[PDB]
């Protein structure tokens, strides 16, 4: 749930969604999203968090290689 | 403009626990003083991909939410 909120705040701060959407989405997610819809959201966010992790590794690897 | 994207990306990595403060600081030093033009290009491409993925995620979440509304009918 923390990942969902973080992601949504990031999207808002970058201008991809507005405040109304942040509120509506998070309310829906917590209280009205079905088990299937939650699974859909979680998979999208999970993929994103995995790609972010991978990016971290790539940056760390690039830095390290440059040093030796 | 790409510079702000790099800083955003780095903050994201830090806030998610992928890097620590020492790495962030060293990375900035490395980027400014030691990174080759190729290495800088590699960093910029990684960050661009991340900003595009973030945009895409937004669309996916908005579309999922929209679909959920329609399915109430
Ligand atoms: Mg986390």
Numbering used by the authors:
A (entry chain B): 533 to 600
B (entry chain A): 531 to 603
Quote the paper.
Here, we report that VEL proteins contain a domain related to an atypical four-helix bundle that engages in spontaneous concentration-dependent head-to-tail polymerization to assemble dynamic biomolecular condensates. The VEL domain adopts a compact globular fold, consisting of four α-helices in a quasi-antiparallel “up-down-up-down” configuration, each of which contributes to the hydrophobic core, as illustrated by VEL1VEL.
To test the function of VEL polymerization in FLC silencing in plants, we generated WT and mutant VIN3-GFP transgenes bearing R556D and I575D (RI>DD) for stable transformation of the Arabidopsis null mutant vin3-1 FRI. Indeed, dimers are seen in every single crystal, regardless of the mutant, space groups, or crystallization conditions. Interestingly, these dimers result from mutual domain swapping of H4 between individual VIN3VEL monomers whereby molecule A donates its H4 to molecule B in an adjacent VIN3VEL filament, and vice versa. In contrast, the RI>DD transgene did not complement the FLC silencing defect of vin3-1 FRI, resulting in derepression of FLC, with high FLC transcript levels comparable to those seen in the null vin3-1 FRI mutant; importantly, the defective FLC silencing in the RI>DD rescue lines occurred both during and after cold exposure (orange).
